[PDB]
Ligand SMILES: OC[C@H]1O[C@@](CO)(O[C@H]2O[C@H](CO)[C@@H](O)[C@H](O)[C@H]2O)[C@@H](O)[C@@H]1O
């Protein structure tokens with residue numbers, strides 16, 4: 013494989029002698045040159061591990077690096093300042109100062125200009141991170157909520173222009189808020205130019221997707237493929253009008269890009285540089301698990317998939333150091349954590365903690381949650397979890413069957429219970445969720461519904477508000493960057509009428525994608541309403557998290573409460589958090605607390621608590637005790 017020095021001399025060959033001389037003395041080239049030397053070896057290594065002796069590898073690499081230079085050269089000075097800032101502070105993602113939020117621009121604020129006007133609200137809430145859902149052009153009608161991309165550069169006209177987006181990103185930065193957007197790199201819509209030209213036989217786009225002449229290959233692959241949306245189609249393939257079959261892991265209108273073609277990597281890398289120069293701070297790496305296929309395997313989490321992601325990482329270290337990756341891997345816990353690494357995805361969703369929060373509310377038993385917090389919470393240095401309560405997607409019970417078996421719990425039977433409970437098919441359940449993708453051949457099923465609908469707020473369960481506070485308290489204090497599903501902070505319920513829209517009727521996830529509720533947000537400062545109670549409670553926890561150093565970092569140690577209903581953990585050996593998942597008063601004995609100071613201040617309720625005697629927590633009460 014070639015080296016950094018050689019490649020750089022060739023990149024400069026596009027200039028005349030006088031220009032070349034000038035470029036080599038510029039600060040921009042100096043920085044680019046240093047980063048090339050430091051990070052190129054990784055880029056070469058990862059790419060080689062995937063493409064090997066592929067003839068197109070070197071040519072593709074030189075083209076990409078040429079684009080890399082032009083991209084960095086054009087990169088705005090403000091962004092270049094951030095590049096340096098994050099190079100010197102890789103742990104900014106681990107600061108307790110960070111609190112994120114996510115919303116659809118259209119549902120939450122109408123359009124981009126409307127969103128820009130909501131920025132004062134985000135500052136009021138205390139956000140420092142904002143993820144905006146798919147913003148670019150997609151098919152009219154059904155596009156999997158924007159996840160079927162028809163253009164990575166043309167903004168969805170209904171939202172505004174690429175110009176409004178630039179202003180939004182600049183405004184966010186002015187307010188001290190990082191811009192987070194999706195990098196849907198595993199597939200494009202079937203209306204994307206690449207897909208159209210590839211299917212039409214354009215040699216320029218040959219091998220950009222996985223297309224087969226018949227069911228021979230598809231049938232063989234399907235033997236080991238997991239179905240994501242079985243409601244839509246079986247296996248992972250869809251048939252074209254001409255009879256051929258195309259790999260479609262998700263919806264039939266979403267075609268998986270073929271990364272076994274180095275030109276696909278180059279193409280997507282170019283798109284990443286485009287987003288990078290808009291000022292994006294974090295790219296949500298959508299469906300990272302599926303970017304590599306291999307007959308005989310599940311085609312998920314394969315070695316090449318990780319290598320490719322690490323190659324993309326190297327590209328940013330070279331041409332846009334400020335850009336970090338947020339891994340979206342909703343799979344087995346042993347697989348989830350493998351995507352998280354300083355040289356891969358610096359942060360990633362923590363589906364395990366999330367799913368177990370809901371699990372514990374249902375069972376009133378923290379065994380699984382405790383297990384996860386004890387054995388699967390801490391991460392490598394310079395990386396962090398993105399802890400959440402809900403997202404734009406359904407809830408999947410992604411806990412490990414192996415872990416559950418250690419506790420005498422049958423994973424399969426347990427999920428059957430959880431699914432019945434959360435769709436209100438279990439005596440006494442307070443949840444009002446909706447089924448999503450019940451798979452007759454596997455028994456699997458997920459849950460749709462807002463946090464408020466799942467805790468019983470729709471029917472005004474008196475514990476509803478407290479349940480919400482409990483869930484968010486854990487995501488905000490366990491260690492990592494907490495992500496708030498905007499709307500949850502005022503108790504927004506389901507979009508009861510989603511099933512009336514023919515474009516949404518077959519996707520229950522829209523039940524938990526309601527628009528901005530004017531009535532609820534208008535009540536946020538009224539302590540007599542559910543909206544105000546939830547809002548003030550979450551705002552308080554956010555304020556405490558950001559101002560109290562005890563929450564800094566992502567490391568934690570669990571504390572055995574000796575009460576199956578109470579979760580316990582310690583942050584920085586100075587903050588003892590307790591969470592009662594029972595609707596009844598629960599006690600932590602004086603005996604269990606012997607090692608703690610006799611008195612401790614509770615950051616939640618603001619009172620001094622005695623720890624040299626039995627400590628009784630009210631239903632769903634949460635305590636953040638400063639023990640140091
Ligand atoms: O500058 C190094 C050296 O490269 C040569 C080829 O050996 O020319 C290349 O670089 C020039 C300046 O960037 C380009 O104008 C030229 O087209 C390119 O081939 C030498 O001529 C030059 O001394």
Ligand SMILES: OC[C@H]1O[C@@](CO)(O[C@H]2O[C@H](CO)[C@@H](O)[C@H](O)[C@H]2O)[C@@H](O)[C@@H]1O
Pocket residue numbers: 219222270272
């Ligand atoms: O067949 C799977 C996978 O292999 C690739 C790798 O380039 O194509 C190879 O196999 C094809 C069918 O046998 C050949 O026509 C092709 O020349 C060969 O490189 C991928 O294109 C394909 O997805």
Ligand SMILES: OC[C@H]1O[C@@](CO)(O[C@H]2O[C@H](CO)[C@@H](O)[C@H](O)[C@H]2O)[C@@H](O)[C@@H]1O
Pocket residue numbers: 243446447448449450451511517518519520521
């Ligand atoms: O149940 C309401 C509504 O949800 C949809 C769309 O997601 O299907 C879900 O519910 C069905 C019945 O429980 C499941 O069989 C299906 O797998 C699940 O996605 C609509 O089809 C249904 O009308």
